[PDB]
Each structure stands twice: as C-alpha cells, then as structure tokens.
CSV table of N, CA and C in Angstrom, one decimal:
chain,number,residue,atom,x,y,z
J,1,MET,N,-20.3,-76.3,-40.8
J,1,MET,CA,-21.2,-76.9,-39.9
J,1,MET,C,-22.3,-76.0,-39.6
J,2,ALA,N,-22.8,-75.4,-40.6
J,2,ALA,CA,-23.9,-74.4,-40.5
J,2,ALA,C,-25.1,-75.3,-40.4
J,3,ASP,N,-26.3,-74.4,-40.0
J,3,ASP,CA,-27.6,-75.0,-40.2
J,3,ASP,C,-28.3,-75.1,-41.5
J,4,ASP,N,-28.7,-73.9,-42.0
J,4,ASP,CA,-29.2,-73.9,-43.2
J,4,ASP,C,-28.5,-72.8,-44.2
J,5,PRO,N,-28.8,-73.0,-45.4
J,5,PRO,CA,-28.2,-72.1,-46.4
J,5,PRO,C,-28.7,-70.6,-46.4
J,6,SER,N,-30.0,-70.5,-46.4
J,6,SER,CA,-30.7,-69.1,-46.3
J,6,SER,C,-30.7,-68.6,-44.8
J,7,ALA,N,-30.9,-69.5,-44.1
J,7,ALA,CA,-30.9,-69.1,-42.4
J,7,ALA,C,-29.6,-68.6,-42.0
J,8,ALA,N,-28.6,-69.0,-42.7
J,8,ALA,CA,-27.2,-68.5,-42.6
J,8,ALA,C,-27.1,-67.0,-42.1
J,9,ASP,N,-28.0,-66.3,-43.0
J,9,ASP,CA,-28.0,-64.8,-42.8
J,9,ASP,C,-28.5,-64.4,-41.4
J,10,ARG,N,-29.3,-65.3,-40.9
J,10,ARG,CA,-29.7,-65.0,-39.4
J,10,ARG,C,-28.5,-65.1,-38.4
J,11,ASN,N,-27.9,-66.1,-38.4
J,11,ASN,CA,-26.8,-66.5,-37.5
J,11,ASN,C,-25.6,-65.6,-37.8
J,12,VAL,N,-25.5,-65.1,-39.0
J,12,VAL,CA,-24.4,-64.2,-39.4
J,12,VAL,C,-24.5,-62.9,-38.6
J,13,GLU,N,-25.6,-62.2,-39.0
J,13,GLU,CA,-25.8,-60.9,-38.4
J,13,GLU,C,-25.4,-60.9,-36.8
J,14,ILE,N,-25.7,-62.2,-36.2
J,14,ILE,CA,-25.2,-62.4,-34.7
J,14,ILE,C,-23.9,-62.0,-34.5
J,15,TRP,N,-23.1,-62.8,-35.2
J,15,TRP,CA,-21.5,-62.4,-34.7
J,15,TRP,C,-21.0,-61.4,-35.8
J,16,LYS,N,-21.9,-61.2,-36.9
J,16,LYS,CA,-21.4,-60.1,-37.9
J,16,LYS,C,-21.6,-58.7,-37.3
J,17,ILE,N,-22.8,-58.6,-36.6
J,17,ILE,CA,-23.1,-57.3,-36.1
J,17,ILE,C,-22.2,-57.0,-34.8
J,18,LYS,N,-22.0,-57.9,-34.0
J,18,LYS,CA,-21.1,-57.7,-32.9
J,18,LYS,C,-19.7,-57.3,-33.3
J,19,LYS,N,-19.2,-57.9,-34.3
J,19,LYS,CA,-18.0,-57.7,-34.8
J,19,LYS,C,-18.0,-56.4,-35.5
J,20,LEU,N,-19.0,-56.0,-36.1
J,20,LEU,CA,-19.2,-54.9,-36.9
J,20,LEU,C,-19.0,-53.4,-36.1
J,21,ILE,N,-19.8,-53.3,-35.1
J,21,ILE,CA,-19.7,-52.3,-34.2
J,21,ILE,C,-18.4,-52.1,-33.6
J,22,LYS,N,-17.8,-53.3,-33.3
J,22,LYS,CA,-16.5,-53.5,-32.5
J,22,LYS,C,-15.3,-53.0,-33.6
J,23,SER,N,-15.5,-53.2,-35.0
J,23,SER,CA,-14.7,-53.0,-35.9
J,23,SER,C,-14.7,-51.4,-36.2
J,24,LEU,N,-15.9,-51.1,-36.6
J,24,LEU,CA,-16.1,-49.6,-36.9
J,24,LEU,C,-15.6,-48.6,-35.8
J,25,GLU,N,-15.9,-48.7,-34.7
J,25,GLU,CA,-15.3,-47.9,-33.6
J,25,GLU,C,-14.0,-48.0,-33.5
J,26,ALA,N,-13.4,-49.0,-34.0
J,26,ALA,CA,-11.8,-49.2,-34.1
J,26,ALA,C,-11.3,-48.6,-35.3
J,27,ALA,N,-12.0,-48.6,-36.4
J,27,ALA,CA,-11.8,-47.9,-37.6
J,27,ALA,C,-10.9,-46.6,-37.5
J,28,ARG,N,-9.8,-46.4,-38.0
J,28,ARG,CA,-9.0,-45.1,-38.0
J,28,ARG,C,-8.3,-44.9,-39.1
J,29,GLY,N,-7.8,-43.5,-39.4
J,29,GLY,CA,-7.1,-43.2,-40.5
J,29,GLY,C,-6.9,-41.8,-40.7
J,30,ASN,N,-6.4,-41.3,-41.8
J,30,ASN,CA,-6.2,-39.9,-42.0
J,30,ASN,C,-7.7,-39.2,-41.9
J,31,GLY,N,-7.7,-37.9,-42.2
J,31,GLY,CA,-8.9,-37.1,-42.1
J,31,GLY,C,-9.8,-37.4,-43.1
J,32,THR,N,-10.6,-38.3,-42.9
J,32,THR,CA,-11.8,-38.9,-43.8
J,32,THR,C,-13.1,-38.9,-43.2
J,33,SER,N,-14.2,-39.2,-44.0
J,33,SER,CA,-15.5,-39.2,-43.4
J,33,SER,C,-16.2,-40.5,-43.8
J,34,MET,N,-17.0,-41.1,-42.8
J,34,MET,CA,-17.6,-42.4,-42.9
J,34,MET,C,-19.1,-42.0,-43.1
J,35,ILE,N,-19.9,-43.1,-43.6
J,35,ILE,CA,-21.3,-43.0,-43.7
J,35,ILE,C,-22.2,-44.1,-43.0
J,36,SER,N,-23.2,-43.6,-42.2
J,36,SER,CA,-24.0,-44.5,-41.2
J,36,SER,C,-25.5,-44.3,-41.4
J,37,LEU,N,-26.2,-44.8,-42.3
J,37,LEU,CA,-27.4,-44.6,-42.5
J,37,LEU,C,-28.4,-45.8,-42.2
J,38,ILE,N,-29.7,-45.6,-41.7
J,38,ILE,CA,-30.4,-46.7,-41.5
J,38,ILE,C,-31.9,-46.5,-41.9
J,39,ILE,N,-32.5,-47.3,-42.8
J,39,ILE,CA,-33.9,-47.2,-43.1
J,39,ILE,C,-34.8,-48.1,-42.3
J,40,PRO,N,-35.4,-47.6,-41.1
J,40,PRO,CA,-36.2,-48.4,-40.2
J,40,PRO,C,-37.6,-48.5,-40.8
J,41,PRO,N,-38.5,-49.4,-40.2
J,41,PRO,CA,-39.8,-49.7,-40.6
J,41,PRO,C,-40.7,-48.4,-40.3
J,42,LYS,N,-40.1,-47.4,-39.5
J,42,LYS,CA,-40.9,-46.4,-39.0
J,42,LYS,C,-40.6,-45.1,-39.9
J,43,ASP,N,-40.1,-45.5,-41.1
J,43,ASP,CA,-39.6,-44.3,-42.1
J,43,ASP,C,-39.8,-45.0,-43.5
J,44,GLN,N,-39.5,-44.1,-44.5
J,44,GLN,CA,-39.4,-44.5,-45.9
J,44,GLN,C,-38.1,-44.3,-46.4
J,45,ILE,N,-37.8,-45.1,-47.4
J,45,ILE,CA,-36.5,-44.9,-48.3
J,45,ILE,C,-36.3,-43.5,-48.9
J,46,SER,N,-37.4,-42.9,-49.0
J,46,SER,CA,-37.2,-41.5,-49.5
J,46,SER,C,-36.8,-40.6,-48.5
J,47,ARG,N,-37.3,-40.8,-47.2
J,47,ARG,CA,-36.8,-39.9,-46.2
J,47,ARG,C,-35.3,-40.1,-46.0
J,48,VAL,N,-34.7,-41.1,-46.1
J,48,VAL,CA,-33.3,-41.3,-45.7
J,48,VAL,C,-32.5,-40.7,-47.0
J,49,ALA,N,-32.9,-41.0,-48.3
J,49,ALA,CA,-32.4,-40.4,-49.3
J,49,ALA,C,-32.5,-39.0,-49.4
J,50,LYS,N,-33.6,-38.3,-48.9
J,50,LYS,CA,-34.0,-37.1,-48.9
J,50,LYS,C,-33.0,-36.2,-47.9
J,51,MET,N,-33.0,-36.7,-46.6
J,51,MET,CA,-32.2,-35.9,-45.8
J,51,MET,C,-30.6,-35.9,-46.1
J,52,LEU,N,-30.2,-37.0,-46.8
J,52,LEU,CA,-28.9,-37.1,-47.2
J,52,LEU,C,-28.7,-36.1,-48.5
J,53,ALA,N,-29.7,-36.3,-49.3
J,53,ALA,CA,-29.5,-35.3,-50.6
J,53,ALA,C,-29.1,-33.8,-50.2
J,54,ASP,N,-29.7,-33.3,-49.1
J,54,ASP,CA,-29.3,-32.0,-48.7
J,54,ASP,C,-28.0,-31.9,-48.1
J,55,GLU,N,-27.6,-32.8,-47.3
J,55,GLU,CA,-26.4,-32.9,-46.7
J,55,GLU,C,-25.2,-33.0,-47.8
J,56,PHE,N,-25.6,-33.3,-48.9
J,56,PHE,CA,-24.5,-33.5,-50.1
J,56,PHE,C,-24.3,-32.2,-50.5
J,57,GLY,N,-25.2,-31.3,-51.0
J,57,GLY,CA,-25.1,-30.0,-51.5
J,57,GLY,C,-24.3,-29.1,-50.5
J,58,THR,N,-24.5,-29.3,-49.3
J,58,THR,CA,-23.7,-28.6,-48.3
J,58,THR,C,-22.5,-29.1,-48.0
J,59,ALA,N,-22.3,-30.4,-48.4
J,59,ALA,CA,-20.9,-31.0,-48.1
J,59,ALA,C,-20.0,-30.6,-49.1
J,60,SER,N,-20.3,-30.1,-50.2
J,60,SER,CA,-19.6,-29.5,-51.4
J,60,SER,C,-19.0,-28.1,-50.7
J,61,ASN,N,-19.6,-27.7,-49.8
J,61,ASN,CA,-18.9,-26.4,-49.2
J,61,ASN,C,-17.7,-26.5,-48.5
J,62,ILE,N,-17.4,-27.9,-48.0
J,62,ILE,CA,-16.2,-28.1,-47.3
J,62,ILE,C,-14.9,-27.6,-48.1
J,63,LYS,N,-14.0,-27.0,-47.3
J,63,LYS,CA,-12.8,-26.5,-47.7
J,63,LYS,C,-11.8,-27.7,-48.3
J,64,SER,N,-11.7,-28.7,-47.4
J,64,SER,CA,-11.0,-29.8,-47.7
J,64,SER,C,-11.5,-30.8,-48.6
J,65,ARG,N,-11.2,-30.7,-50.0
J,65,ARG,CA,-11.8,-31.8,-50.7
J,65,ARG,C,-11.9,-33.2,-50.1
J,66,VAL,N,-10.9,-33.4,-49.4
J,66,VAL,CA,-10.7,-34.7,-48.8
J,66,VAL,C,-12.0,-35.2,-48.2
J,67,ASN,N,-12.5,-34.4,-47.3
J,67,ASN,CA,-13.7,-34.8,-46.6
J,67,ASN,C,-14.9,-34.7,-47.4
J,68,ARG,N,-15.0,-33.5,-48.3
J,68,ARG,CA,-15.9,-33.5,-49.3
J,68,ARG,C,-16.2,-34.7,-50.0
J,69,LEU,N,-15.1,-35.1,-50.6
J,69,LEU,CA,-15.1,-36.2,-51.3
J,69,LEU,C,-15.5,-37.7,-50.6
J,70,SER,N,-15.3,-37.6,-49.4
J,70,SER,CA,-15.6,-38.6,-48.5
J,70,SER,C,-17.2,-38.6,-48.2
J,71,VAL,N,-17.7,-37.4,-47.9
J,71,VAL,CA,-19.0,-37.4,-47.5
J,71,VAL,C,-19.8,-37.5,-48.7
J,72,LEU,N,-19.5,-36.9,-49.9
J,72,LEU,CA,-20.3,-36.9,-51.3
J,72,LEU,C,-20.1,-38.3,-51.8
J,73,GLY,N,-18.9,-38.7,-52.0
J,73,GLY,CA,-18.7,-40.0,-52.6
J,73,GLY,C,-19.4,-41.1,-51.8
J,74,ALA,N,-19.5,-41.2,-50.6
J,74,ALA,CA,-20.1,-41.9,-49.7
J,74,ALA,C,-21.7,-41.8,-49.9
J,75,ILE,N,-22.2,-40.7,-50.0
J,75,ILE,CA,-23.7,-40.5,-50.0
J,75,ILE,C,-24.2,-41.0,-51.4
J,76,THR,N,-23.4,-40.8,-52.4
J,76,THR,CA,-23.9,-41.3,-53.7
J,76,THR,C,-23.8,-42.7,-53.8
J,77,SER,N,-22.7,-43.5,-53.3
J,77,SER,CA,-22.5,-44.9,-53.3
J,77,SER,C,-23.6,-45.6,-52.6
J,78,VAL,N,-24.1,-45.0,-51.3
J,78,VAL,CA,-25.3,-45.6,-50.6
J,78,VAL,C,-26.6,-45.1,-51.2
J,79,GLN,N,-26.5,-43.9,-51.7
J,79,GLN,CA,-27.9,-43.4,-52.4
J,79,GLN,C,-28.4,-44.5,-53.5
J,80,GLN,N,-27.5,-45.1,-54.3
J,80,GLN,CA,-27.9,-45.9,-55.3
J,80,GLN,C,-28.2,-47.2,-54.7
J,81,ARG,N,-27.9,-47.4,-53.4
J,81,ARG,CA,-28.2,-48.8,-52.9
J,81,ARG,C,-29.7,-48.7,-52.4
J,82,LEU,N,-30.0,-47.6,-51.5
J,82,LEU,CA,-31.3,-47.5,-51.2
J,82,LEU,C,-32.4,-47.5,-52.2
J,83,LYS,N,-32.1,-46.9,-53.2
J,83,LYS,CA,-32.9,-47.0,-54.4
J,83,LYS,C,-33.3,-48.3,-54.9
J,84,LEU,N,-32.5,-49.4,-54.4
J,84,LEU,CA,-32.7,-50.6,-54.8
J,84,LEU,C,-33.7,-51.3,-53.9
J,85,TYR,N,-33.8,-51.0,-52.6
J,85,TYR,CA,-34.7,-51.5,-51.7
J,85,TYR,C,-35.9,-50.4,-51.3
J,86,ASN,N,-36.6,-50.1,-52.3
J,86,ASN,CA,-37.6,-49.2,-52.3
J,86,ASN,C,-38.6,-49.4,-51.0
J,87,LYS,N,-38.5,-50.7,-50.6
J,87,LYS,CA,-39.2,-51.2,-49.3
J,87,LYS,C,-38.6,-50.9,-48.1
J,88,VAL,N,-39.2,-50.7,-47.1
J,88,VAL,CA,-38.5,-50.3,-45.7
J,88,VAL,C,-38.6,-51.6,-44.9
J,89,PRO,N,-37.5,-52.4,-44.7
J,89,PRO,CA,-37.5,-53.5,-43.7
J,89,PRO,C,-37.7,-53.2,-42.3
J,90,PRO,N,-38.1,-54.0,-41.4
J,90,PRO,CA,-38.2,-53.9,-40.1
J,90,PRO,C,-36.9,-53.9,-39.3
J,91,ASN,N,-36.0,-54.8,-39.8
J,91,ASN,CA,-34.8,-54.7,-39.2
J,91,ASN,C,-33.9,-53.7,-39.3
J,92,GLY,N,-34.4,-52.7,-40.4
J,92,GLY,CA,-33.7,-51.5,-40.8
J,92,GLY,C,-32.6,-51.7,-41.5
J,93,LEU,N,-32.6,-51.2,-42.8
J,93,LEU,CA,-31.4,-51.3,-43.8
J,93,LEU,C,-30.2,-50.4,-43.4
J,94,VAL,N,-29.2,-51.1,-42.9
J,94,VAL,CA,-28.0,-50.3,-42.5
J,94,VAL,C,-27.1,-50.2,-43.7
J,95,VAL,N,-26.4,-49.0,-43.8
J,95,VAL,CA,-25.4,-49.0,-44.8
J,95,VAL,C,-24.1,-48.2,-44.3
J,96,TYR,N,-22.9,-48.8,-44.7
J,96,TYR,CA,-21.6,-48.3,-44.3
J,96,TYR,C,-20.8,-47.9,-45.4
J,97,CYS,N,-20.3,-46.6,-45.6
J,97,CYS,CA,-19.5,-46.2,-46.6
J,97,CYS,C,-18.5,-45.2,-46.1
J,98,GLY,N,-17.2,-45.6,-46.3
J,98,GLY,CA,-16.0,-44.8,-46.0
J,98,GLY,C,-14.8,-45.3,-46.4
J,99,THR,N,-13.6,-44.5,-46.0
J,99,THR,CA,-12.4,-45.0,-46.4
J,99,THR,C,-11.3,-44.5,-45.3
J,100,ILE,N,-10.7,-45.6,-44.8
J,100,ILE,CA,-9.7,-45.5,-43.5
J,100,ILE,C,-8.3,-46.2,-44.1
J,101,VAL,N,-7.2,-45.5,-43.8
J,101,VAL,CA,-6.0,-46.0,-44.1
J,101,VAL,C,-5.1,-46.1,-42.9
J,102,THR,N,-4.4,-47.1,-42.6
J,102,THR,CA,-3.4,-47.3,-41.6
J,102,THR,C,-2.2,-46.7,-41.9
J,103,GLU,N,-1.2,-46.8,-40.8
J,103,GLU,CA,0.2,-46.3,-41.0
J,103,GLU,C,0.8,-46.9,-42.0
J,104,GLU,N,0.5,-48.1,-42.4
J,104,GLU,CA,1.1,-48.9,-43.5
J,104,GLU,C,0.9,-48.1,-44.8
J,105,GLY,N,0.1,-47.2,-44.8
J,105,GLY,CA,-0.2,-46.4,-46.1
J,105,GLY,C,-1.1,-47.0,-47.0
J,106,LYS,N,-2.0,-48.0,-46.4
J,106,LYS,CA,-3.0,-48.7,-47.2
J,106,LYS,C,-4.4,-48.3,-46.9
J,107,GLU,N,-5.0,-47.9,-47.8
J,107,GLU,CA,-6.5,-47.5,-47.7
J,107,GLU,C,-7.4,-48.7,-47.6
J,108,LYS,N,-8.6,-48.5,-47.0
J,108,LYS,CA,-9.7,-49.6,-47.0
J,108,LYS,C,-11.0,-49.1,-47.2
J,109,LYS,N,-11.7,-49.4,-48.3
J,109,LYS,CA,-13.0,-49.1,-48.8
J,109,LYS,C,-13.9,-49.8,-48.0
J,110,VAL,N,-14.7,-49.0,-47.2
J,110,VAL,CA,-15.8,-49.5,-46.5
J,110,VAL,C,-17.1,-49.8,-47.2
J,111,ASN,N,-17.6,-50.9,-47.4
J,111,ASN,CA,-18.7,-51.3,-48.1
J,111,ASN,C,-19.5,-52.2,-47.6
J,112,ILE,N,-20.5,-51.9,-46.8
J,112,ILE,CA,-21.4,-52.9,-46.1
J,112,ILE,C,-22.9,-52.4,-46.1
J,113,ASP,N,-23.7,-53.3,-46.4
J,113,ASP,CA,-25.2,-53.1,-46.5
J,113,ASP,C,-26.0,-54.2,-46.2
J,114,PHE,N,-26.8,-54.3,-45.1
J,114,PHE,CA,-27.6,-55.6,-45.0
J,114,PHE,C,-28.6,-55.3,-43.8
J,115,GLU,N,-29.6,-56.3,-43.7
J,115,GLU,CA,-30.4,-56.1,-42.5
J,115,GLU,C,-30.1,-57.0,-41.3
J,116,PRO,N,-29.9,-56.3,-40.1
J,116,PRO,CA,-29.4,-56.8,-38.9
J,116,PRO,C,-30.5,-57.8,-38.2
J,117,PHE,N,-30.3,-58.3,-37.2
J,117,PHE,CA,-31.2,-59.2,-36.4
J,117,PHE,C,-32.2,-58.4,-35.4
J,118,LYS,N,-31.7,-57.2,-35.2
J,118,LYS,CA,-32.5,-56.2,-34.3
J,118,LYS,C,-33.0,-55.1,-35.0
J,119,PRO,N,-34.1,-54.6,-34.5
J,119,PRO,CA,-34.9,-53.5,-35.0
J,119,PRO,C,-34.1,-52.3,-34.9
J,120,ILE,N,-34.4,-51.1,-35.8
J,120,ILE,CA,-33.8,-50.0,-35.8
J,120,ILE,C,-34.8,-48.9,-35.1
J,121,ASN,N,-34.2,-48.2,-34.1
J,121,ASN,CA,-35.1,-47.3,-33.4
J,121,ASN,C,-35.8,-46.3,-34.4
J,122,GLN,N,-34.8,-45.5,-35.2
J,122,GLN,CA,-35.5,-44.5,-36.2
J,122,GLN,C,-34.3,-43.9,-37.0
J,123,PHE,N,-34.9,-43.1,-37.9
J,123,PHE,CA,-33.8,-42.5,-38.7
J,123,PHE,C,-32.5,-41.7,-38.0
J,124,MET,N,-31.3,-42.1,-38.3
J,124,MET,CA,-30.2,-41.6,-37.6
J,124,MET,C,-29.3,-41.1,-38.5
J,125,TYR,N,-28.6,-39.9,-38.3
J,125,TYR,CA,-27.5,-39.3,-39.0
J,125,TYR,C,-26.1,-39.7,-38.6
J,126,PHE,N,-25.2,-39.6,-39.5
J,126,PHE,CA,-23.7,-40.0,-39.3
J,126,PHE,C,-22.9,-38.9,-39.0
J,127,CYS,N,-21.8,-39.0,-38.2
J,127,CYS,CA,-20.9,-37.8,-37.9
J,127,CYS,C,-19.6,-38.0,-38.8
J,128,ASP,N,-18.9,-36.9,-39.0
J,128,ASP,CA,-17.6,-36.9,-39.7
J,128,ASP,C,-16.4,-37.4,-38.9
J,129,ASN,N,-15.6,-38.1,-39.4
J,129,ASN,CA,-14.4,-38.6,-38.8
J,129,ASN,C,-14.8,-39.3,-37.4
J,130,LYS,N,-15.8,-40.2,-37.6
J,130,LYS,CA,-16.3,-41.2,-36.6
J,130,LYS,C,-17.4,-41.9,-37.2
J,131,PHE,N,-17.6,-43.1,-36.8
J,131,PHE,CA,-18.6,-44.1,-37.2
J,131,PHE,C,-19.8,-43.9,-36.3
J,132,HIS,N,-21.1,-43.6,-36.8
J,132,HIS,CA,-22.3,-43.6,-35.9
J,132,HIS,C,-23.1,-44.9,-35.8
J,133,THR,N,-23.1,-45.3,-34.6
J,133,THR,CA,-23.6,-46.7,-34.4
J,133,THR,C,-24.1,-46.8,-32.9
J,134,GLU,N,-25.5,-46.1,-32.7
J,134,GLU,CA,-26.2,-46.2,-31.5
J,134,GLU,C,-26.8,-47.6,-31.3
J,135,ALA,N,-27.8,-47.7,-32.1
J,135,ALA,CA,-28.7,-49.0,-31.9
J,135,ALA,C,-27.7,-50.2,-32.0
J,136,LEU,N,-26.6,-50.2,-32.6
J,136,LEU,CA,-25.7,-51.3,-32.5
J,136,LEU,C,-24.8,-51.5,-31.3
J,137,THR,N,-24.0,-50.4,-30.8
J,137,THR,CA,-23.4,-50.4,-29.6
J,137,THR,C,-24.4,-50.5,-28.5
J,138,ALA,N,-25.6,-50.1,-28.8
J,138,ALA,CA,-26.6,-50.2,-27.6
J,138,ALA,C,-27.1,-51.7,-27.4
J,139,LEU,N,-27.9,-52.1,-28.4
J,139,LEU,CA,-28.3,-53.5,-28.3
J,139,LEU,C,-27.4,-54.5,-27.9
J,140,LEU,N,-26.3,-54.6,-28.7
J,140,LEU,CA,-25.2,-55.5,-28.6
J,140,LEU,C,-24.9,-55.5,-27.0
J,141,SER,N,-24.9,-54.3,-26.5
J,141,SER,CA,-24.4,-53.9,-25.1
J,141,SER,C,-25.6,-54.3,-24.2
J,142,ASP,N,-26.7,-54.2,-24.5
J,142,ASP,CA,-27.9,-54.6,-23.6
J,142,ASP,C,-28.0,-56.2,-23.7
J,143,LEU,N,-28.3,-56.6,-24.8
J,143,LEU,CA,-28.4,-58.2,-25.0
J,143,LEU,C,-27.3,-58.9,-24.5
J,144,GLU,N,-26.1,-58.4,-24.8
J,144,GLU,CA,-24.9,-59.0,-24.4
J,144,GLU,C,-23.8,-58.1,-23.9
C-alpha cells in the first residue's frame, strides 16, 4: 500500500534510518571493528577515501589481526563503494561495514550504503568496537 515506486526510497529512510541507528547502537559481538563514513555536500568523495587510506596503513599495525582485518576489510569494502559515487550528494552518502556475532556463534556481515532524508553535518570518523552515528542519533532525536 505504498505511494510511489521511486518515492519509496524517501519514505524508507524515514523508518529505515530510525531503525538503523537503533540497531547499530544495539549491535554487539566479539572484539571486532565497524565502519561509519559519510560523504556530505560540504566535502569531496576524495576526502573521505583519503582520510581512510591513511587509517588503513596504520590499522595494519594492530597486534590483534581480528581488529586489523575488521578495520582494513571494511575500509576496502567501502572504499570501492565511494569510488562509485564520484559525486557528493546533499543527504550525505552513509556507509556501514562491520561484522558482529551473537552468543549463538553466528556472525553478521554489516553491509549498508544509501542517502538518508536528512543532511550530513560534515566528515565524521568512526570508532573501533562501536558504531559512530551522531547526525543520526541526533537528528532522529531532535525531529522525533
């Protein structure tokens, strides 16, 4: 009972974003590392892929291959995505890459990338062992 086929993307981000930040913050598992990058209109796709490129070479210094493979594997997975959207959208291109496993011993490959309904403040970095979502938990909190 939706409205339009293409417009669906609009109504989606609505309940998709709110549930996203609510899910990520809940995401838990062994010692892993997630990825959270955003390409706002006040920046260039080269900047995001640039600041990440450096974080990669330094991530290989990690003692625990687990995290290293989580930070590097995610950076490369997303890096290939940004190269697809050479253009910088206003809603900011968000990207999520990580792997969380529950007590059941089942891993979960985090793969998400799309343009939300709200604009992105600016270039934001992600933290290890925790999802980085300020503009998300903020906006959704303010508006609703």
